[PDB]
Amino acid sequence: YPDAPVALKPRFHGRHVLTRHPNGLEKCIGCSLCAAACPAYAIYVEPAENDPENPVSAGERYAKVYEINMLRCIFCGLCEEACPTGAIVLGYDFEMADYEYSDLVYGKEDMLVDVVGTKPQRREAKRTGKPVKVGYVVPYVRPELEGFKAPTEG
């Protein structure tokens, strides 16, 4: 059924997403706590000092580099669990197969809330000029994915 979208439960463990507050600040404070709890060593974090004029988060610390190896990742939600800010929350995407090992290491810009599609989806939808079509539908979005607009007609 690649014709009819698969309904997954609102709790499902999909492609990680980083969230923002309303203010627009990123929730992440590059504490690297999520990476520290990961049983599979699949998160790499390089911190950075906020710019008072042009802020990224709220504290004095934001995430310069944020990288997850989607091949290493087991999808526990241990990271979402260890987070103090509600930053890294597993989302719904699953259509994320690909060809070259190192292409599957997602970056911060692959995961921000605003992003719609997995790496391969958006890339193809790049060289094609055709919008991204996700293959899922959910009854509603978790409260924890506040913002993450997705197919929720139910």
Partner 1 sequence: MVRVKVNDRIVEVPPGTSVMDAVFHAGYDVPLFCSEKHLSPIGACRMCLVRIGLPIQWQPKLAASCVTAVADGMVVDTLSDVVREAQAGMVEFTLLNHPLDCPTCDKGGACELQDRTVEYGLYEKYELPVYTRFEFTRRHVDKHHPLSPFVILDRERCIHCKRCVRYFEEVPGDEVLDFIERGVHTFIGTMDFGLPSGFSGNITDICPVGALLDLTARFRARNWEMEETPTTCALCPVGCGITADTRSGELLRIRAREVPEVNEIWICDAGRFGHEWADQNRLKTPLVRKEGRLVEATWEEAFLALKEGLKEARGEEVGLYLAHDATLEEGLLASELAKALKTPHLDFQGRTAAPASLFPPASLEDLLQADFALVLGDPTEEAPILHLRLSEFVRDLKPPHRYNHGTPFADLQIKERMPRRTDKMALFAPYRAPLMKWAAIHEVHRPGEEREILLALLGDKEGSEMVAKAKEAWEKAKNPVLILGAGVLQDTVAAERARLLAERKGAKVLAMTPAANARGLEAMGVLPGAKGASWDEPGALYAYYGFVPPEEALKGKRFVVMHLSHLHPLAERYAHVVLPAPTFYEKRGHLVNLEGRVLPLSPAPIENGEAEGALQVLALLAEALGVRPPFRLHLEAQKALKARKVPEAMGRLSFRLKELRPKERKGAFYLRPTMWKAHQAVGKAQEAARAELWAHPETARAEALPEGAQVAVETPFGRVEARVVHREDVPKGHLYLSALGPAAGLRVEGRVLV
Partner 2 sequence: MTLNVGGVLRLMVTLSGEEVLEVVPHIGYLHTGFEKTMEHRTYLQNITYTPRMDYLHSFAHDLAYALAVEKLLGAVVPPRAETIRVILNELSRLASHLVFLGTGLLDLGALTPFFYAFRERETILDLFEWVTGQRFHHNYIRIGGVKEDLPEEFVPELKKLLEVLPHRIDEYEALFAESPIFYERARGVGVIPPEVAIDLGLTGGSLRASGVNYDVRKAYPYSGYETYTFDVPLGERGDVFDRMLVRIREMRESVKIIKQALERLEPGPVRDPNPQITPPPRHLLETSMEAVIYHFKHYTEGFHPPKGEVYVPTESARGELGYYIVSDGGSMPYRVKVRAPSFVNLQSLPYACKGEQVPDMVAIIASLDPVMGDVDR
Partner 3 sequence: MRLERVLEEARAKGYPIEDNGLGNLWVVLPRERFKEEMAHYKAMGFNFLADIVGLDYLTYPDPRPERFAVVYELVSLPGWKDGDGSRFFVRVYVPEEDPRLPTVTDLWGSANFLEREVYDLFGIVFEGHPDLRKILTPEDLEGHPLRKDYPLGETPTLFREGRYIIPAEFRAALTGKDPGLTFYKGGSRKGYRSLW
List interacting residues with partner 1 (CB under 8 A): 29, 31-33, 36, 45-49, 59-61, 84-85
32 or 125: whose CB is closer to partner 2? Answer: 32
Q: Does 8 bind partner 2 (CB under 8 A)?
A: yes
Residues 18, 11: Cα–Cα separation, whole Å: 16
Q: How many residues bind ligand SF4 (CB under 6 A)?
A: 28
Q: Is 93 helix (H, G, I), strand (E, B) or coil?
A: coil
Beta-carbon count within 10 A of 56 CB: 18
Q: How many residues bind partner 3 (CB under 8 A)?
A: 13
Instruction: Tell me if 56 sits within 8 A of 25, measured CB to CB.
Output: yes
For 17, the token pair is 């997403």
The breaks in the chain (C to N more than 2.5 Å) occur after none
Q: Would you call 129 exposed, middle or buried from its count of C-beta atoms within 10 A (0-12, 13-18, 19+)?
A: exposed
Counted residue by residue, the chain has a size of 154
For 91, the token pair is 């989302």
Residue 107, contacted partner among partner 2, partner 3, ligand SF4, none, CB below 5-8 A by kind: partner 3
Residue 48, contacted partner among partner 1, partner 3, ligand SF4, none, CB below 5-8 A by kind: partner 1
Q: Does 107 bind partner 3 (CB under 8 A)?
A: yes
Q: What is the DSSP letter of 39?
A: T
Does residue 57 have a known ligand-binding role? no
Q: Does 18 bind partner 3 (CB under 8 A)?
A: no
**Which residues does the annotation place in the binding site for [4Fe-4S] cluster?**
28, 31-32, 34, 38, 73-74, 76, 79, 83
Give the footprint of partner 2 on this chain (CB under 8 A).
8-13, 33, 36-37, 39, 74-78, 81-82, 84, 90
Residue ranges for the binding site?
A: 28, 31-32, 34, 38, 73-74, 76, 79, 83
